[PDB]
Amino acid sequence: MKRRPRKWKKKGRMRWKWIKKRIRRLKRQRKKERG
Amino acid sequence: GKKAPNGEFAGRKLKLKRKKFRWSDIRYKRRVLRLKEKSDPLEGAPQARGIVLEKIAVEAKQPNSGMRKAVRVQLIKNGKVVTAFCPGDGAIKFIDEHDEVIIEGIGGPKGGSMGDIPGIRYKVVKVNRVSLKELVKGRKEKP
Amino acid sequence: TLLDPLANALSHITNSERVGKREVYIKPASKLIGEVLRVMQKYGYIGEFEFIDDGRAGVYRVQLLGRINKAGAIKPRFPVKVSEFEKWEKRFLPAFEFGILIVSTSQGVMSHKEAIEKGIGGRLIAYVY
Amino acid sequence: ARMHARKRGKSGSKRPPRTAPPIWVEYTVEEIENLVVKLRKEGYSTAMIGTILRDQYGIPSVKLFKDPDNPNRNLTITRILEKHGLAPEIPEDLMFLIRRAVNLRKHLEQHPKDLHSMRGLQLIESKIRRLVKYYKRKGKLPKNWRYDPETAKLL
Amino acid sequence: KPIIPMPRSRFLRVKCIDCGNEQIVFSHPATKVRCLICGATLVEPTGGKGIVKAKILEVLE
Amino acid sequence: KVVGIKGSVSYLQALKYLKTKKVTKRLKEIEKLVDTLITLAPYAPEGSKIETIRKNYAKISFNKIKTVSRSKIGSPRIKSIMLLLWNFGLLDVKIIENSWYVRKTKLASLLEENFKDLSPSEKLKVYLLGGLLVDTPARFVYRCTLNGVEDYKGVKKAILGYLSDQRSNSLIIGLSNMLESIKFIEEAQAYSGKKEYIGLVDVAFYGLSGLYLDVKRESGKLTVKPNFRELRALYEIDKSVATGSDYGLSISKEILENLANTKRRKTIFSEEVQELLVNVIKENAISISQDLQNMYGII
RNA sequence: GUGGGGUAACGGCCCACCAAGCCGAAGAUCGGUACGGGCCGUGAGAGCGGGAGCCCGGAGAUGGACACUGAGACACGGGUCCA
RNA sequence: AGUGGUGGCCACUAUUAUUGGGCCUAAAGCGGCCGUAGCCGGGCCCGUAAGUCCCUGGCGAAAUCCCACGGCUCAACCGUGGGGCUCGCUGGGGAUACUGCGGGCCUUGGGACCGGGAGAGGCCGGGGGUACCCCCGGGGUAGGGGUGAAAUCCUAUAAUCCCGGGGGGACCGCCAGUGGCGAAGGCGCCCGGCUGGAACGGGUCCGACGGUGAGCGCGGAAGGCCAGGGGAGCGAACCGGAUUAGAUACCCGGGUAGUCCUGGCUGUAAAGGAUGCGGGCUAGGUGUCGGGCGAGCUUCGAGCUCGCCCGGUGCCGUAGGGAAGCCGUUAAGCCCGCCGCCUGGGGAGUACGGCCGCAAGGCUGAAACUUAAAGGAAUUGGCGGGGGAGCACUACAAGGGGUGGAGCGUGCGGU
């Protein structure tokens, strides 16, 4: 997972750890749809 | 450190580094890969010809509140459909459904959205091979 | 590590001139450094100089008159014919003939005006003004 | 030492700019040929021999004495060793690195979970590689000669 | 910082107390300088200059 | 399932270089790997019970298996080479709970015994050929090739035929394993676009490509092609010692004429080596026969 | 490489034998794109961009394939065939 | 007699940076070390002349370009004459300063060795520590626990608590640091053994043996996983008790994986000094850590005080640099080598593909489309269930007065 430091700022924006976790959920879901 | 290499016998890495980092920019990449003209509805055509389908007005982006008139046109060269703003005071009154029209770019920044009207990219010039500007001024008559 | 004595020596000289120090030593003494130093001494920017052995490489001692504004080394040894000197001078000298350039031609290293005189090109080495 | 430690430590020491051998000494050039063969024939590495000369014999530097057999060269302990065929084949420092590597490797075989010594092994190896490449260029070793752990054990 | 460094370590003509041997020795030896004949130690090498035990006649350079 | 090889699909393609003589780093790695494994395994004359493994076999510790750089090898690579060796009937290998146990075969300890000093590439080629002549699954695949089969479906129809020959007792188990591996990869090679996995058919096609085969990839398929010069050569070599069955699949007209039409190729190795191999296999044919019967057969 | 055939002619260009070479991370191979140059636009210039118009060279005649005549063609206003 | 709109290209833009871009805080240094090819390399002598430079032959067509003159009224156009080019060539001569090339000579860079000394440098064996938990016995009733309150929860076969005795896993407080050591992550009970490294004194021995590092390799916090052991305390999930409009939380009572050991995998982070590494230069002062020297003291152990040299690590700071924040001999200043990284913000660390891994995931990585900002530093005010003060009877501490309860007068709202 490459990560941009600027995104770590919360200014007008959800926390970045949860974004990373959510998109991980999406990755696993789509691939499992592929299988 | 010092911007490197600089050796007399080192021009290869110099030009390699330069060419690689050229790819960082966007305009040259757009030119060489020909992205604009493989995404262009007009295929680099300064103007295009099409047929009118319907008239819709759009809400000016805030804080500008306004009903900017525009039309939906499918062009003849390929069959794609686009939106075209209609400049002029009471301009929309001249334009009708099923009208042959001539369309070009609007002149926004990077040809994009022009000021306070988002999404639109184009304006009409001639309708039925008759310039719209004089029709707005009423000097000429639509056929 | 050490990759060229000449550039470091010229940089050291210029730095000491900014603080206006009076006596300067250059540790890696060579024939070429001595010859180039004589070359601009011919034109007066530096006063007396000497070589002192140390049993390793000798040291080069100079007293400074504080009339130099910048003495830099042109590292990538650009070779140039006679004609194009004005092209390079504009790249390094502030004004017309303002100071010198140092070129190693077939006969040795000497000033650039004298090089124009004899009409013999060569490798740009350093500049000072 | 800065290749690996990158530590700027200056433990180096001073040797003035004297060219001729000192006056106050007494030993002759052939006398010190005799002395160096005597010391070396008991198996003393050349730096240790030079130290011995400096300390008890009080002779500053063998380099300070010009080689009688060559006016264009100055006398070094190694040249005296080879002047009678007792100079070692594999030069000394690299042999030292060899034996150190061997002894370490034994300890490591005994101790598998000491990764700091693994790093040390990597470093001393790269040292031996670099000196091997150097001597290959200078032709003081066979070109086909190679460092190998088994032959190192044999050495 | 001196432009040329000098050798702080000097040589010494020293006299062995037992057999009256004369020897040139280093001020900072590394081993145990042992007398030539009597075999008594004259200087012992330390962190800095090794501690001399015999009697000193003179210094050299 | 039976062969979970992952992420080394192109690794075994390198054996095609063995046919020609252009050495490459991959080949040297392969050679060092295979002979290291061969020395690793012992040849206990016995061993058939689940308990005999782990008392007369060799445990493998992958982290011990290293190149000659004190570097490492990806475990799937070692898995692949060992799979190949078993498939050519050189290594008796068994998968147990998170461990692999191995032993030398009777073919091994004889091939190496008589060809100790040959060049590494020669040792590889002779190992493969020796595996090929005796009745192994490699022999089955080779005969399928002779019968014009060039697809997973051709070899599948072959395997169904031979099970429906019902005289398959020599290699019921291994051939069934081959069918199983063909399952769960047939879709990957054909239906699903992505291949990303290796079966026994692939580690056969590779391994034969070190002698006479060239293989093409298309959407995961493993299309096969033979040459005819070296194909003819090793066919003559096989006819030199007929210690093998046709498996009820005779050479088609097209292949037969192509073999007959072509000219003559050099006999791979020295004729002395070829003759030593020939008599070695001829004199010990029965012992290897029973060994392989125990190996892949049932009774 | 050998020894030959063929050609206005040298040459795997072609053929029979012998041998396994040959290229590649200073980037082959594969794909993308495009007639090359004199030149032209712009820039204080370093440079970037383009190769339509005139001149030189190359290539083509709906796509492909094949000949006759001719010093000279596989031939835009000569010939044969398929699509 | 052209002006306007659109679309394409150069400038603007040193927004492509060789001349000449930056990467602590605005996007931009790999988590660290190792090293191949490549790039860049110490001093001196001798010889060559490949590169390098000057002279000279051939050659780089015309058209187009610069200049004078002449013809067309002038011009544009054309001619005569002179000069130039994409310049990629090549013959011969001359020169040797540099670079390259071969031979020699020498230590400063770098390496090796040795003498004491320092340090949580590593592995391995033994010994102990206090603390906690369990178990046995002895003593004593009536609770303990825990919160803001409570409650759950444990106990009258006796709890909490005190004494005696046995077992167990984890750990190694104060001394302790602004200290040390390690390349980095990291490293702290005592003793013994094996091992790595540095600094200092000595150039003693080697003679440039080197810096950088594309591709390569190694180890590398917590956590997760795999197989087998272990599990005192703590504690993901989960189970109960509370609070709450709402509890999926913060609090409390329990509790599985985990946290430990043996072998293997996973390559991650605020792995941040957010600062890639080597050399030379550029004012100082101040303390501690190591080593050496000079001293003075010394109940005589560098044990105690001062100065100096180097090595590591802070603070202040002259010049100086920067948008400022601030940095400033441990440089974010001036030169010198090499590698990595970046080119408005979203879309995106996404889709597709490749490769790695058992898996979770790791390494590479777009485009469409949308936007004037996004962002960095910093001044004044404003505001704080932030802090520090001092005031207030239109506030509050203390006394005293009276409404909301009945009715009237009287203004406002609802009808």
UniProtKB/Swiss-Prot annotation, chain B:
Cellular component GO terms, alphabetical: small ribosomal subunit
The keyword Ribosomal protein belongs to this UniProt entry's keyword annotation: yes
GO molecular function, one term: structural constituent of ribosome
Top-rank lineage group of the source organism: Archaea
Keywords: Ribonucleoprotein, Ribosomal protein, RNA-binding, rRNA-binding
Keyword Ribosomal protein: yes
GO biological process: translation
Quaternary context: Part of the 30S ribosomal subunit.
Protein family according to the UniProt entry: Belongs to the universal ribosomal protein uS12 family.
The protein's role, per its UniProt record: With S4 and S5 plays an important role in translational accuracy. Located at the interface of the 30S and 50S subunits.
Protein name: Small ribosomal subunit protein uS12
From Swiss-Prot, chain C:
Residue intervals passing through the bilayer: none
GO-annotated biological processes: translation
Pfam family, any one: Ribosomal_S8
GO molecular function: rRNA binding; structural constituent of ribosome
Keywords: Ribonucleoprotein, Ribosomal protein, RNA-binding, rRNA-binding
GO CC list: ribonucleoprotein complex; ribosome
Function noted in UniProt: One of the primary rRNA binding proteins, it binds directly to 16S rRNA central domain where it helps coordinate assembly of the platform of the 30S subunit.
Assembly with partners or alone: Part of the 30S ribosomal subunit.
PANTHER family: 40S RIBOSOMAL PROTEIN S15A (PTHR11758)
Family of this protein: Belongs to the universal ribosomal protein uS8 family.
Protein known as: Small ribosomal subunit protein uS8
Record organism: Pyrococcus furiosus (strain ATCC 43587 / DSM 3638 / JCM 8422 / Vc1)
This protein's encoding gene: rps8
UniProtKB/Swiss-Prot annotation, chain D:
Biased composition regions of type Basic residues, renumbered to the chain: 1-17
Record-linked Gene3D superfamilies: 4.10.860.130, S15/NS1, RNA-binding
Region (Disordered): 1-20
GO annotation (BP), single: translation
GO MF entries: small ribosomal subunit rRNA binding; structural constituent of ribosome
Keywords: Ribonucleoprotein, Ribosomal protein
GO cellular component, one term: cytosolic small ribosomal subunit
A family per Pfam: Ribosomal_S15
PANTHER family found in the cross-reference section: RIBOSOMAL PROTEIN S15P/S13E, SMALL RIBOSOMAL SUBUNIT PROTEIN US15
Assembly mode: Part of the 30S ribosomal subunit.
Family under the similarity heading: Belongs to the universal ribosomal protein uS15 family.
Protein name listed in UniProt: Small ribosomal subunit protein uS15
Organism listed in the record: Pyrococcus furiosus (strain ATCC 43587 / DSM 3638 / JCM 8422 / Vc1)
Gene name as annotated: rps15
Curated annotation (Swiss-Prot), chain E:
Secretion signal span: none
Keyword set, alphabetical order: Metal-binding, Ribonucleoprotein, Ribosomal protein, Zinc, Zinc-finger
SUPFAM superfamilies assigned to the protein according to its UniProt record, in alphabetical order: Zn-binding ribosomal proteins
Pfam family, one: Ribosomal_S27e
Keyword Chaperone attributed: no
GO molecular function annotation: structural constituent of ribosome; zinc ion binding
Cofactor(s), by name: Zn(2+)
Gene Ontology biological process: translation
PROSITE patterns, per the entry: RIBOSOMAL_S27E
Cofactor note: Binds 1 zinc ion per subunit.
HAMAP family per record: Ribosomal_eS27
Family (UniProt): Belongs to the eukaryotic ribosomal protein eS27 family.
UniProt protein name: Small ribosomal subunit protein eS27
Organism: Pyrococcus furiosus (strain ATCC 43587 / DSM 3638 / JCM 8422 / Vc1)
